[PDB]
């Protein structure tokens, strides 16, 4: 009922690529979805992509998906590769250009993590 | 029972590279063909060539698809993807010249957004 | 019941090298052989050499392939791919001096168009 | 009821990488996780990775799997294969750099076998 | 039963170069090997060397391979290529200094033409 | 359990270039090494040097390849090829200065020719 978010929560927008056509690769993305799509994507990203550290995050009613990937993708890519799975009411997807600090903002409030393929993520490893 | 188009829509046409055997390679392509085959299309042409963005736009009850890709194609490789895949009434495959211009004309009278891969395409991104 | 023909019908002669063992590169190319045969090999052509056109053509019971190249490849090369895939009862694999005539009679009795890559091919483009 | 292990036993630590992002690929891991769900890992990581060898050992109420694969892998990619299958109270995954000592540190006390694929494992082959 | 032979038959003798550790490079070679080992070598020479032409020939209950390159090699390239695709009972390789000659002689007895990428070969080509 | 040899069979020294270090370019080589990795190593090389010729010997319940090279090349570039592919127990490789001496050796007591690229080598040819 609500409009669904046209782009990552303000607070945030300092650590992405905004850059959604670029020819550039990445190894760090962020996505904003639906709690639904977000726990199915949390699961589908995590072995699309080999990653090597995904999370999922409370924002605002809805969740945030944060990765980092072994090797590099467009962001274009990775938007593909969500849209070949599921429709969705909102999908938002950047790269991320400072992963320690949007992970360590994911992880205090106004956001929570939910669930990650490491306890205590980029906080406590490398 | 109306003849098929045999070309793309005369108001588009200065947008269009016109030299469909070419050796040259492009970035941006576009595709007049049924309803029911661009919508197939849309999603193999995603995949199959990594698209940067995809859009889908009713045109005269037929459709086109608007492309951009992250590496550079031959018109007649698109043309004969398009082919492997399917049989078609009519196919007409062109490259694009004028890649915001295209988009931009797609999105308004007597065209309009059918589906797209990021919402306002073009018109809101780089 | 027939002998197979030996080569081209002679009045498509003129437009083709017969030095079929020449290391010389060419962009267009003809081949001569059954219906069945043929009807395979326009798939398999059009993506082994990302052709720029390729038509198929009746001609005397049998089939005429024509099709042009974005890169070049010796005679040779082309007569050992169709071999790679199929036996055959005759294959004969020339290429096209005089593309545009080559077409243009393919379209005129006593040939006719079966299949083509793009409508009207080199009558209507380039 | 007692807090699960943050990272596996101190006497084993100067044995493993703990850079556990890394993309450096190994083929020694271990896991430390539930007895429960390291018998089920024990067969699943057995098939999934085509091991060169497995053991299953007692490690303070909980169990360490032990493995050498044939192919190189990433940490994180045997962390997300294990997450694919099991939800877990506890799961540490970390490759092992000292394979011989490792091994040999988990059939001696504190430590024992339960179950191995090959009996005697690095102590009695290469 | 018979002892393999030891080098091509005497009456071929005159059109082969004996030099098989030349560091010359040739465009035209010859194979003396198994009915069954010939068979394979015919479709592996062919692409892995895109053959200008290659036949295989009868001789003495054995075959010979016959073919033009249209880039040259050293025979040691071409006898370390058949060697990384299979064990022979027997193989001999030499280039071939008299290419019509050597031609013409295996498709008269004692010798005759099983297969060829060409009909005819160079007694009706080039 | 016996120490591993540091250098080449005495009676072999004489026909070897000592010189490890040396700038200077050959194009005959030997490598002392294990069975089994001379096993592998005769594969390897063979392809990637592309050898004239190529033998693998018995020695000492060790293996001596020894071959020649249509190009020339430093002796350490080969110790490095050995050594991109595989750790060893031990290696051992120089250049030969005395090309036809050296295989003659091998092929006699106390060595033996386990298989090669020509049979007889260097005492059948060139």
Not at 29 to 43: D, H, N, R, S, V
Request: charged residues 20%; aromatic residues 14%; contains cysteine.
């Amino acid at each position: 009922k609500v409009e669904d978010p046209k782009d990552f929560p303000s607070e945030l927008l300092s650590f992405l690529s905004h850059a959604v056509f670029s020819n550039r690769t990445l190894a760090c993305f962020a996505i904003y979805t639906t709690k639904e799509k977000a726990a199915l994507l949390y699961k589908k990203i995590m072995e699309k992509y080999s990653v090597t550290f995904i999370s999922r995050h409370n924002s605002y009613n809805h969740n945030i998906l944060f990765f980092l990937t072994p090797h590099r993708h467009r962001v274009s890519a990775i938007n593909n590769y969500a849209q070949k799975l599921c429709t969705f009411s909102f999908l938002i997807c950047k790269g991320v250009n400072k992963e320690y600090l949007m992970y360590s903002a994911l992880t205090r409030d106004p956001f929570s993590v939910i669930e990650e393929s490491l306890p205590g993520g980029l906080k406590e490893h490398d």
